Structures are given as structure tokens and as C-alpha cells.
Amino acid sequence: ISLQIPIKLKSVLVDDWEYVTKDKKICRLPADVTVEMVLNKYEHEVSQELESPGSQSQLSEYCAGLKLYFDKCLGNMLLYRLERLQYDELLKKSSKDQKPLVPIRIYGAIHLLRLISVLPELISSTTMDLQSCQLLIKQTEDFLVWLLMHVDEYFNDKDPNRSDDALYVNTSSQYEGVALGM
């Protein structure tokens, strides 16, 4: 199924891949702009302008299922090998408190962005229908557009050397070694 990702989102995804794999930078976690809260803002800002009850409840279902799927798939299909070390570190830090893991409250705006890139590749290997796939694709497109309006605030240019609050952080030689050696 064809997906029409905006050109700016495609550029952002390319930049993320380059930063993670080429520059070895990893995401600055926990994000001040997380997946759960962006989804909440999206649902709040769209629902207040939408009056139809069916599409409003389907918006809530779409957001909840998106949160569930993101939580279920971050640790499986949405991480490079380099970020697996930081993922394991967060996992063990949470397990030290016997606490569960809530990726939507740690990751934000960019692992959600990378989440909807294999959706055509994920739905294709299912037994689900066509119009439900069409509905889901339309919902994703509307969410993408809403993000496109609020785009000057989720991916801002700050250098890790010039800004500690930069979206990316420089990694250590020991960290890079353990991550990319095993």
C-alpha cells in the first residue's frame, strides 16, 4: 500500500538514520516531548475541532492502538543495533525498581515518527481487510499532517557540543565499543 509521507518528515527520518548510524549519536532520553504526550496533544487538538462522534471515537481508538503498538514494537523492530545498548541500560534501570517500561513516556516524536514508516510492510503480512487498512492509512495521514503544522517545535537544530538540551547526545568510546562489538 502506498503511503504519502511529507518531504520534510522524510528528510527528518534520513537525518535520524544518519545521526544514529553515521554520527553514532543516540537520542537524548527521556525526551521532553514524548510519544504519549504528542499523541495526547494530537487527540485533544483534533477532537475539539471534530464534532462527528464516530470519527472522534475512532480517533481515540486509533491513538490508543497506536500507543499499544508502539509500546509493543519499540523493543523489536524500531531500534538500531547502536541504540540497543541504551535500551538495555534503561531496561535494567527500570528492572532495578521492579517497575514496568513505558516507552511512550521516554521516547518521543522521532521513534513514533520512525514507527509509521513500515506500516505498509506490517499490514501487508496480515489477514486484515482492505477498507480497514484504508481507514488506518487515512488516520496516519491526518496525524502526519497535524504533525506537519506543529513541526517547528519537535525537531529543532541544536548541537550537542553547543546545547545540552540538543535532541542528540554524543556517545562515549566505551559505550560505542560495547554497543557495536556485541
User: Which stretches of the chain bind other proteins, using CB under 8 A?
Assistant: 5-8, 10-11, 13-14, 17-18, 21-22, 28, 61-62, 64-66, 68-69, 72-73, 75-81, 84-85, 87-88, 91, 114, 117-118, 120-123, 125-128, 132, 135-136, 157-162, 164, 169-175, 177-179, 181-182
Reference 174, options 86, 107, 87; nearest CA is 86
- Rounded least distance, CB 115 to other proteins, Å: 10
Phi, psi torsion values for 41, nearest 5 degrees:
-65, -40
> E strand or H helix at 76, and its extent?
helix 53-77
Q: How far is the CB of 121 from other proteins (least distance, A)?
A: 6
Rounded Cα gap, residues 48 and 169, in angstroms: 37
Q: How far is the CB of 160 from other proteins (least distance, A)?
A: 6
- In whole angstroms, the minimum distance from the beta carbon of 51 to other proteins comes to 22
With 0-12 CB in 10 A as exposed, 13-18 as middle and 19+ as buried, what is 164? exposed
Cα torsion 82, 84, 87, 93: sign: negative
Closer Cβ to other proteins, 50 or 128, answer by number: 128
Between residues 32 and 170, which has the closer beta carbon with respect to other proteins?
170
Cβ proximity to other proteins, 6 vs 105, nearer residue: 6
Torsions phi, psi of 89, nearest 5?
-65, -45
Nearer to other proteins, 84 or 105 (CB): 84
Torsion of CA 62, 122, 120, 48, to 10 degrees: 10
Question: Which CB atom, from 38 or from 137, has the smaller least distance to other proteins?
Answer: 137
109: Cβ contacts below 8 Å, ≥ 6 apart: 31, 33, 34, 35, 38, 154, 155
The CB-of-125 to other proteins minimum distance in angstroms stands at 8
Of 48 and 127, the one with the shorter C-beta distance to other proteins is: 127
